[PDB]
């Protein structure tokens, strides 16, 4: 997140860190004790065998005994278009079930077909690049955002912050867009650059796939 604020300690207990070596590379969202939702390109050319699904985290710069690391069992995709960046959603099955603590909780999704219009206030998060200076975020980061329809596709849900150069950057892909306590977006791609101020940041449109998510999660 560029131009954002630190999150309160585990204020968003559904926030997941997808790690490869020991470094963060994508974020995710816990939608069930044994399921994780993220971005399809986050696993496109990676050995999913080696990805550890870190959950219940705050500062990924050292070890937290409240953190619960998992591995990927099953990978579901509903037609990811790697070139057009369409349907950039993936459901990752867990290895096991997570302890629903105060630090780990199950996020919730909207209904199939729910479209947010321009003007709706949303919130983005991620451990991605920390902003202008300073790289990957050591501490989860927050950012108030508003939905835009201009310079966007309904094959996405788009987000702009008006009056400042701020928005999602590299490493935030797969992280959720919370709108009224509902997960409406998955961080897919930016245009021209992260906090460009002219091109809207694009999220994967969760509401278009819920019926598909419910067939895996139920």
């Amino acid at each position: 997140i560029v131009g954002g604020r630190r999150a309160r300690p585990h204020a968003w207990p559904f926030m997941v860190s997808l790690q490869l070596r020991g470094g963060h590379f994508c974020g995710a969202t816990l939608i069930a004790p044994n399921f994780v939702m993220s971005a399809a390109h986050c696993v496109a050319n990676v050995n999913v065998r080696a990805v550890r699904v870190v959950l219940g985290a705050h500062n990924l710069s050292r070890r937290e005994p409240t953190r619960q690391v998992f591995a990927v069992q099953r990978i579901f995709e509903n037609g990811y278009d790697p070139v057009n960046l369409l349907n950039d959603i993936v459901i990752l099955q867990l290895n096991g079930s997570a302890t629903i603590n105060a630090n780990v909780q199950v996020a919730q999704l909207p209904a199939q077909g729910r479209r947010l219009g321009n003007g709706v206030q949303c919130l983005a998060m991620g451990w991605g690049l920390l902003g202008r200076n300073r790289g990957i975020a050591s501490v989860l980061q927050e950012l108030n955002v508003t939905v835009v329809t201009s310079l966007c596709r309904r094959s996405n849900v788009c987000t702009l912050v008006r009056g400042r150069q701020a928005g999602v950057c590299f490493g935030d892909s797969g992280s959720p867009l919370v709108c009224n306590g509902l997960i409406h977006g998955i961080a897919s791609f930016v245009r021209g650059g992260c906090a460009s101020g002219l091109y809207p940041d694009a999220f994967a449109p969760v509401a278009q796939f819920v019926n598909w998510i419910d067939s895996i999660i139920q």
Partner: peptide
């Protein structure tokens, strides 16, 4: 690629 897309 920028205006084509810049997947993070």
């Amino acid at each position: 690629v920028s205006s084509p897309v810049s997947t993070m």
